[PDB]
Nucleic acid binder design. Structure first.
Ligand SMILES: C/C=C\C=C\[C@@H]1O[C@](O)([C@H](CC)C(=O)NC/C=C/C=C(\C)[C@@H](OC)[C@@H](C)[C@@H]2O[C@H](/C=C/C=C/C=C(\C)C(=O)c3c(O)cc[nH]c3=O)[C@H](O)[C@@H]2O)[C@H](O)[C@H](O)C1(C)C
Ligand SMILES: Nc1nc2c(ncn2[C@@H]2O[C@H](COP(=O)(O)OP(=O)(O)O)[C@@H](O)[C@H]2O)c(=O)[nH]1
Ligand SMILES: [Mg+2]
Ligand SMILES: [Mg+2]
Ligand SMILES: [Mg+2]
Ligand SMILES: [Mg+2]
Ligand SMILES: [Mg+2]
Ligand SMILES: [Mg+2]
Ligand SMILES: [Mg+2]
Ligand SMILES: [Mg+2]
Ligand SMILES: [Mg+2]
Ligand SMILES: [Mg+2]
Ligand SMILES: [Mg+2]
Ligand SMILES: [Mg+2]
Ligand SMILES: [Mg+2]
Ligand SMILES: [Mg+2]
Ligand SMILES: [Mg+2]
Ligand SMILES: [Mg+2]
Ligand SMILES: [Mg+2]
Ligand SMILES: [Mg+2]
Ligand SMILES: [Mg+2]
Ligand SMILES: [Mg+2]
Ligand SMILES: [Mg+2]
Ligand SMILES: [Mg+2]
Ligand SMILES: [Mg+2]
Ligand SMILES: [Mg+2]
Ligand SMILES: [Mg+2]
Ligand SMILES: [Mg+2]
Ligand SMILES: [Mg+2]
Ligand SMILES: [Mg+2]
Ligand SMILES: [Mg+2]
Ligand SMILES: [Mg+2]
Ligand SMILES: [Mg+2]
Ligand SMILES: [Mg+2]
Ligand SMILES: [Mg+2]
Ligand SMILES: [Mg+2]
Ligand SMILES: [Mg+2]
Ligand SMILES: [Mg+2]
Ligand SMILES: [Mg+2]
Ligand SMILES: [Mg+2]
Ligand SMILES: [Mg+2]
Ligand SMILES: [Mg+2]
Lengths: 62, 371, 82, 205, 85
RNA sequence: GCCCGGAUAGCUCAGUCGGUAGAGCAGGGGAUUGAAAAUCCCCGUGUCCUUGGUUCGAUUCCGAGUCCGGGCACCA
RNA sequence: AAUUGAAGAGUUUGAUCAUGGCUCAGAUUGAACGCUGGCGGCAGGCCUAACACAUGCAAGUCGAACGGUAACAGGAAGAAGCUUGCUUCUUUGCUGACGAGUGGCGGACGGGUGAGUAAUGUCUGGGAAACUGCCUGAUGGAGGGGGAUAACUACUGGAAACGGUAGCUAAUACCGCAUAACGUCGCAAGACCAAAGAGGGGGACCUUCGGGCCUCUUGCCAUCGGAUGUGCCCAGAUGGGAUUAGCUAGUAGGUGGGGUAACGGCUCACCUAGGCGACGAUCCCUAGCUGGUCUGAGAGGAUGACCAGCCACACUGGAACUGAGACACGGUCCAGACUCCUACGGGAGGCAGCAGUGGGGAAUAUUGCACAAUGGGCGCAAGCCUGAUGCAGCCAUGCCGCGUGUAUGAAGAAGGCCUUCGGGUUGUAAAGUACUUUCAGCGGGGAGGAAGGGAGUAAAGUUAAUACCUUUGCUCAUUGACGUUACCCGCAGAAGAAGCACCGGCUAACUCCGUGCCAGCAGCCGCGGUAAUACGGAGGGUGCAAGCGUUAAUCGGAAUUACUGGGCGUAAAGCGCACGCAGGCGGUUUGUUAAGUCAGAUGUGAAAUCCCCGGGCUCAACCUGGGAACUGCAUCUGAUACUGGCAA
């Protein structure tokens, strides 16, 4: 497959095992999948606040 | 796992620290073959004598292993400096002695190995004096420390003379090293130093119990690198023997339930839930070592990334110096705030060694928790 | 061997037996010929306690069906004169 | 479970008076009712059919303190019943013990009644009950236990109920806090303002 | 597999021994009869049938034969030896 | 746990066997436009994986490390 | 009383109207993942590898079948000390009993899994050519003999596993013989066919003192039954593929012989050449089936996890043996692959039992406690056995309940955010003040699941008998794993307990700042090109709440597979035209038949589940009683208009 890496910025490179959910992007034909940000080797987006259940960010510890 | 380990004769850790191919292992086998006769990776051999219950850990002496040997010599109470009477002091010898001083092992017994190799009362005695002085070199008692001699191979056969000599070796063991103090009071905490996967049982963490007890079935929290996971004990062990309450001060093998082999790496701790919190930033009263201390010899500033060895494993860390200070001169007492990449369970006042460049750099203690 | 026996059903910690004729080899909550009344141990004293269709039972007694100890106790409890 | 937030903002959102801060004192005017839902409360909503439906359902829920789930359960329970769904839903919402207790005057607001019932002050038919969702069967007798009888709050909280319309479907002893639930309330008794029609609509889709 | 109730194995073999032997002798008397039939000696046939009847009923009673097989042998075997006799 | 590799601007890479980092392709700035592309006029815009060392001076020599790949080891 | 029930929206265009897809609003789940996470109740928890499995346990029991006695406890001949009856202590099956052993029974049940299976299965309804241990009804029998062998001793083989030869012995083991009928064969005559005894108590009598005799209990053998269970047979129904049209030689039938509990190409011998197929045979792919579950106004569509019935499998392939029942999960033999043991000569293994491990995977639990309850095995019973079952641990996996406080509280504060800087808003929110304590924390009380069974006693039966025995009252002693139970009472203090998604339209809810077709968002339509209600942050609001989202999946909406309920001049769509077999359909009058059709009746349509009315857990979920429902199928007696068959 060829999943779309969402959020802003990513730690993915070369290999690195990730996690793949469904969902097209409707802008990149051929891409019908998403990456589960925050799950496995794919860290969550840095410094997010709203809608952090997606993108995998934990509740602001501060 | 079948025979119950009866709790008699105080437990004591004791491992060799000699030069490569000086007969450390032959010795660590000889002691057992002798005591198991007349009395009827790091290999942890065991031998029980009427006076004490010793747990010899024979760590490989090569240079590439001066990292895991740290931990192996950390839980150790009194090392057996096995120095060959044919070569005396050597690079690795001094490396371990120095390391066995930075780790801070209280007591030490010198054993001139392979003495039958030479037939002289002046050459062997000479190198003996050499060793006694080299001990004085590192603030060890030196002249006070006993110097046993004898072959480790002859202790393998039936040469009653050398078997007797190494039997008395055990006498010097029980005499020179007193009953150790334990920490059976404050909440239980065990640093992992070796992870196994026994078939039909699962993951088995090992290591000396830093404090407290481990009654089988108690709720435990695995805290350290990566994150944090809950678990419960299921059968504590003692050299392939069963245990009830895993007391403090001795090496054990806890079988953690519901944990995979790859999800509990070496470095984490089995702390009682609510007793500790993992951290990635802390202030510490760092004491830099000089050339007379064997540490660094040149100044450094922010950006310097040395190792911060703790209960077992080390971890690279970012150094941030307090304002009013430009650079850190070697041999100074200065505090600083550190941010290590891998989170490690720690509290205030925790002792630790800042090693770097294949050599130690500066001892320190944790001042304040931040994370 | 046909036998009359309680079938243990109902909730957890809240047993509700259903006396029933069934082959002895059958699973407890398994196959059966016909249920014949019920027993309610935790019912206490109220509108109901233990129903039991004596006619069919009597049909199976002369049919060779061995009544189990509990069900026998119930046959006693429903009596024939009380 | 419970809402336990600003129990007066909701009253502003619904624009009417949910009697949430019905309180001991009478009429509020201590919140700028109606024309102040929030920062953009001055806005006049276009208000879509859905909008009025949802708005209605919420009004009613905020009245009786019932959440969405339990509510929808009440709905399915109303549809499976006889009569007509509209009367049903409100009769079942009326059946809740915290609601009946509230009607008796045993407590100022409805949430007060809830906090009373939950801490074993309420005893119906001699059988003490905690659950507010307990549906009070017709011809029951709700009361207050002696160990919690006339304990400060309940007194004044019952003095309050004297100004209320007071239901004809239930009665109160007033002399020893020994009330008596009777018939199932007629539709033309409660409400006559909250619209069951729109609620029936909302779950019909 | 290790199981104390393995006595069923050694006993079932110790049983197939005897039972097999009996089953054998029976079917061999039956054979004797069939040969009598093929020879055409209706007299010696009747004789052999008389010689086998009690030993088939006797083994049929012992559960070795289901006394259907016994009646079956007695049935058709008689139909033959008397169809010729 | 250990040994051996790979990590040079946005992307793909040349660059050494210490002397002061380039190549192509992209991207930025001014003109033009609603904003672009084309067109014109100008620019590397880089923690040579991080840090330390030996050096006057290290991408380039020697340690310790992180991330990855590969090999060996790992039954209280 | 018992289904009172069917909603639409966005998007093709400059706009419309159609057509036509796409998408959303619902319900659902054995779900996973992200964030957050207090409690209780009831359920659920390896859907991928029928992958490989360390270790423990999952099936034993009967001394009232027997010879025994290896332990243990009592008793006795005798023994040694010494307080000579207080102790030491060898013999002794003689009792209580009970390893190993023979024998009986069970081990074919219970538990698991769904690989194989497109019918050798399942479901529905009938059927005849059967058997059926245990349980039970009826009627008789139960006479008299023998020979073996395990154990056990002697010796000896093998490392173990595991025997070998030679002796001794018992029985409800084994075996003739007597004995027989409404039993088996036969037309009958006639022929033949079985077995076991043990335990309790006992007056006379009889004792070579082994006991005979009496009696109750139980087991034994035969037959006919009953019930139950199983085998078998037929019809209908039970996935997709014609880009699979022919397949079949034990094949289709017959006759005879054998074979099975039983019919039968079930199997041979010969004979006839048939049999199946366009109402889809064969071949291919996929699949356990059903009651049901989900959805739906219904018809339908998807599914069949838990619960229950059936079927199939037990490392792989094959085979039989024992038995009432297997061609057998924790049996046997054989081969094979795979693991381990060895003294290398040979042996051991089968977790799709419960836990557990590795591996796979997005993904699924304790190497728990107990037989106290229900059920099973065995036994006279006591008891034993039981990973069935009952509980407990675990996981928000789901449903349901509750809590996280209530009332008062304007200075309408601080801070935050916004502004036309006048103010607003967060906001009765907070602090303040007054009460409250559920739920967790702590300390006390405390149900119910327990019925039985044992000891004793009186009575009525039994009987030669006030003895034993069976039954019923009646007394004492008692039986709980859950379990520091539910539940109540007391203690302290608001005290320990709120998140998640969203805010352009669909869709409930808006602004400010940061960025500038970049970074990003996106279910659809789409936003971002320096004034973004669409990105990121903040403020505010909305939704839901111990959860909230996302993803995957099914149905709905979708009358977009239309049977109910669509189309085909131009939107997708009349074969280029004809002839025509099978198939479908068929004018009109009379007769008959009654196939369809309809009416009635009876049988069945397992229980649960769904629905309705009640009952019980404080409510709910859940449990539960009765009822209706199970839209079906079959036989039976009618009707005869309409259709079909036959007739004129
Ligand atoms: C360092 C390795 C493991 C240590 C781990 C940690 O050690 C500790 O931090 C430990 C606490 C005692 C600790 O501090 N160790 C961390 C550091 C500790 C430093 C301490 C003690 C100092 O004293 C101030 C220490 C130098 C002091 O000098 C004396 C020795 C001088 C020798 C000089 C040799 C020199 C020049 C030399 O030529 C030389 C050589 O031969 C070989 C190699 N290279 C050299 O160059 C004596 O030996 C004293 O010990 C804790 O025990 C932790 O719990 C720990 C176990 C995590
Ligand atoms: N001849 C002799 N050799 C000895 C004696 N003791 C030890 N050795 C040698 O030491 C070696 C074993 O030591 P080893 O375990 O390799 O050293 P380590 O690994 O550094 O402990 C053997 O090769 C022996 O030959 C002795 O007494 N006599
Ligand atoms: Mg070595
Ligand atoms: Mg809820
Ligand atoms: Mg347009
Ligand atoms: Mg067992
Ligand atoms: Mg005596
Ligand atoms: Mg025995
Ligand atoms: Mg005799
Ligand atoms: Mg016999
Ligand atoms: Mg006859
Ligand atoms: Mg024939
Ligand atoms: Mg025949
Ligand atoms: Mg399959
Ligand atoms: Mg397997
Ligand atoms: Mg047989
Ligand atoms: Mg079996
Ligand atoms: Mg097995
Ligand atoms: Mg298992
Ligand atoms: Mg039991
Ligand atoms: Mg302000
Ligand atoms: Mg409590
Ligand atoms: Mg009771
Ligand atoms: Mg009782
Ligand atoms: Mg009780
Ligand atoms: Mg009693
Ligand atoms: Mg709107
Ligand atoms: Mg968004
Ligand atoms: Mg802006
Ligand atoms: Mg925004
Ligand atoms: Mg449809
Ligand atoms: Mg159409
Ligand atoms: Mg067209
Ligand atoms: Mg035409
Ligand atoms: Mg025609
Ligand atoms: Mg006609
Ligand atoms: Mg008809
Ligand atoms: Mg039914
Ligand atoms: Mg109720
Ligand atoms: Mg009915
Ligand atoms: Mg007609
Ligand atoms: Mg006609």
């Amino acid at each position: 497959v060829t999943s779309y890496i969402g959020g802003e910025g990513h730690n993915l490179q070369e290999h690195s095992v990730i996690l793949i959910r469904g969902g097209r992007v409707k802008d990149l034909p051929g891409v019908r999948y998403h990456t589960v940000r925050g799950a496995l080797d794919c860290s969550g987006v840095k410094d997010r606040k709203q809608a952090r259940s997606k993108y995998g960010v934990k509740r602001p510890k501060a | 796992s079948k025979e119950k380990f009866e709790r008699t004769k105080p437990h004591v850790n004791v491992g060799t620290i000699g030069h490569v191919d000086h007969g450390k292992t032959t010795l660590t086998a000889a002691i057992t073959t002798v005591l198991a006769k007349t009395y009827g990776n790091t290999s942890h051999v065991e031998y029980d004598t009427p006076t004490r219950h010793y747990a010899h850990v024979d760590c490989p002496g090569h240079a590439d292993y001066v990292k895991n040997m740290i931990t192996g010599a950390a839980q150790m109470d009194g090392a057996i400096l096995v120095v060959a009477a044919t070569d005396g002091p050597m690079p690795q010898t001094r490396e371990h002695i120095l390391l066995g001083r930075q780790v801070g092992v209280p007591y030490i017994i010198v054993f001139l190995n392979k003495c039958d190799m030479v037939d002289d009362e002046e050459l062997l005695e000479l190198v003996e004096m050499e060793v006694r002085e080299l001990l004085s070199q590192y603030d060890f008692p030196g002249d006070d420390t006993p110097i046993v001699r004898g072959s480790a191979l002859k202790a393998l056969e039936g040469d009653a003379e050398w078997e007797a000599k190494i039997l008395e070796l055990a006498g010097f063991l029980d005499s020179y090293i007193p009953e150790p103090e334990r920490a059976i009071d404050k909440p239980f905490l065990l640093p992992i130093e070796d992870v196994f996967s026994i078939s039909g049982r699962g993951t088995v963490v090992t290591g000396r119990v830093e404090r407290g007890i481990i009654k089988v079935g108690e709720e435990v929290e695995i805290v350290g690198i990566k994150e944090t996971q809950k678990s419960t004990c299921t059968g504590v062990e003692m050299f392939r023997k069963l245990l009830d309450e895993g007391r403090a001060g001795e090496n054990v093998g806890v079988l953690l339930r519901g944990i995979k082999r790859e999800e509990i790496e070496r470095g984490q701790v089995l702390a009682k839930p609510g007793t500790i919190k993992p951290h990635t930033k802390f202030e510490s009263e760092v004491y830099i070592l000089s050339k007379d201390e064997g540490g660094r010899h040149t100044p450094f500033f922010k950006g310097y990334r040395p190792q911060f060895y703790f209960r077992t494993t080390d971890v690279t860390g970012t150094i941030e110096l307090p304002e009013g200070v430009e650079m850190v001169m070697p041999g100074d007492n200065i505090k600083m705030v550190v941010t290590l990449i891998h989170p490690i369970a720690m509290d205030d006042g925790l002792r630790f060694a800042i090693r770097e460049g294949g050599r130690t750099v500066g001892a320190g203690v944790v001042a304040k928790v931040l994370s | 061997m046909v036998t009359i026996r309680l079938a243990r059903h109902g909730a957890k910690k809240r047993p509700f037996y259903q006396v029933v004729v069934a082959d002895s080899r059958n699973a407890r909550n398994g196959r059966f010929i016909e249920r014949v009344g019920f027993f309610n141990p935790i019912a206490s004293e109220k509108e109901e306690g233990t129903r039991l269709d004596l006619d069919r039972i009597a049909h199976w007694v002369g049919q060779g069906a061995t009544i189990s100890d509990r069900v026998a106790a119930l046959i006693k409890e429903v009596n024939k004169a009380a | 479970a419970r809402y336990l937030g600003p129990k007066l903002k909701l009253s502003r959102r619904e624009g009417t008076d949910l009697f949430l801060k019905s309180g001991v004192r009478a009429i509020d005017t201590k919140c700028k009712i109606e024309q102040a839902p929030g920062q953009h409360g001055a806005r006049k909503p276009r208000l879509s059919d859905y909008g009025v439906q949802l708005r209605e359902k919420q009004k009613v829920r905020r009245i009786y303190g019932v959440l969405e789930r339990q509510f929808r359960n009440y709905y399915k329970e109303a549809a499976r019943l006889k009569g007509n769904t509209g009367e049903n839903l409100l009769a079942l919402l009326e059946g809740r013990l915290d609601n009946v207790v509230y009607r008796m005057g045993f407590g100022a607001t409805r949430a007060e009644a809830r906090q009373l019932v939950s801490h074993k002050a309420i005893m119906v038919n001699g059988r003490v009950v905690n659950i507010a969702s307990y549906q009070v069967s017709p011809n029951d007798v709700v009361s207050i236990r002696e160990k919690a009888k006339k304990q400060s709050r309940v007194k004044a909280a019952l003095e309050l109920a004297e100004q209320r319309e007071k239901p004809t479907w239930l009665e109160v002893d007033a002399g020893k806090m020994e009330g008596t639930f009777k018939r199932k309330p007629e539709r033309s008794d409660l409400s006559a303002d909250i619209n069951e029609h729109l609620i029936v609509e909302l779950y019909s889709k | 597999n290790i199981k104390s109730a393995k006595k069923r194995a050694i006993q079932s073999e110790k049983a197939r021994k005897h039972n097999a032997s009996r089953r054998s002798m029976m079917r061999t008397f039956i054979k004797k009869v069939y040969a009598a039939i093929e020879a055409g000696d209706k007299a010696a046939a009747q004789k052999a049938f008389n010689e086998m009847q009690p030993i088939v009923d006797r083994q049929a009673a012992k559960g070795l034969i289901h006394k259907n097989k016994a009646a079956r042998h007695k049935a058709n075997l008689t139909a033959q030896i008397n169809k010729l006799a």
